[PDB]
């Protein structure tokens, strides 16, 4: 499948001076697997997915160092940022990095990603060519001068092509199924509405992963209204899709459900 690795690095400073908080999270196939946070008494990288527990202390040693180096790198690059945008200190500031790579079905490297946001807005990004920087706004240009000067684009182009792909291979070996899915559980509920009308809410429960399409009708989604996919709390997920109907006209509607863990598309109608 479309296998991926990502590390989401965040640096926060708040008023009350001192030092920015550095969180770094890592994801394989969109599932959190490692985690670092400067707030802890003993700030280590900890394993987040039982299959990571098969890694020697020296792995946790070496990445705790590596992360302590970004806590460093981030502390600075935030200070330059306050510089560029000429901002008055003792306020909240946020700096964010998304790093990582995409793997084909042949374990081919498809694309790499390296980006940065400041104040939650895109600041600078490596293009897909892996040679040039897209820089939105003037302060981002300053940075783009430096990084072209310092061959920074070769430095990452190396990480994404070499070590990313390499460690992704291995994390996938470690995670053999540990591709497990959970089929969705669907009922259709009946909640009446004023003036000879009713609502048709179609719930899907217990599922994993979150990829879900809810379709009721034939083939009309115009009037319908649905909700943000949401975690159950246990691993699994939820969402629902409603539509307004005239009272007693209910029978013609079929709710269609599409999930990867299914044998086939499931459709159901209200049964009182």
């Amino acid at each position: 499948g479309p296998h991926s690795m990502r590390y989401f690095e965040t640096a926060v400073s708040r008023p009350g001076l001192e030092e920015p908080r550095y969180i770094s999270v890592g994801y394989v196939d969109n599932k959190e697997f490692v985690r670092f946070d400067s707030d802890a008494e003993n700030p280590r990288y900890e394993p987040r997915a039982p299959w990571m527990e098969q890694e020697g202390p020296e792995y946790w040693e070496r990445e705790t160092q590596k992360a302590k180096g970004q806590e460093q790198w981030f502390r600075v690059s935030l200070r330059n940022l306050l510089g560029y945008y000429n901002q008055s200190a003792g306020g909240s500031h946020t700096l964010q990095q998304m790093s990582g790579c995409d793997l084909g079905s042949d374990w081919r490297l498809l694309r790499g990603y390296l980006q940065f946001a400041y104040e939650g807005r895109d600041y600078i990004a490596l293009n897909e060519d892996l040679k040039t920087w897209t820089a939105a706004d003037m302060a981002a240009q300053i940075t783009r001068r430096k990084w072209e000067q310092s061959g920074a684009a070769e430095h990452y182009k190396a990480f994404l092509e070499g070590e990313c792909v390499e460690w992704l291979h291995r994390y996938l070996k470690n995670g053999n199924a540990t591709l497990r899915t959970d089929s969705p559980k669907a009922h259709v509920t009946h909640h009446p509405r004023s003036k000879g009308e009713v609502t048709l809410r179609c719930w899907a429960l217990g599922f994993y992963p979150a990829d879900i399409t809810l379709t009721w009708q034939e083939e009309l989604t115009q009037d319908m209204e649905l909700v943000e996919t949401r975690p159950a709390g246990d691993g699994t997920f939820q969402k629902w899709a409603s539509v307004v109907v005239p009272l007693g006209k209910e029978q013609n509607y079929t709710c269609r459900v599409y999930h990867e863990g299914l044998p086939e598309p499931l459709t159901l109608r209200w049964e009182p």
């Binding site: 180096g69 790198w73 070590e163």
Partner: peptide, 9 residues
């Protein structure tokens, strides 16, 4: 493993 950053912003 994580990416190691290079020159600062």
């Amino acid at each position: 493993e994580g990416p190691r950053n290079q020159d600062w912003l």
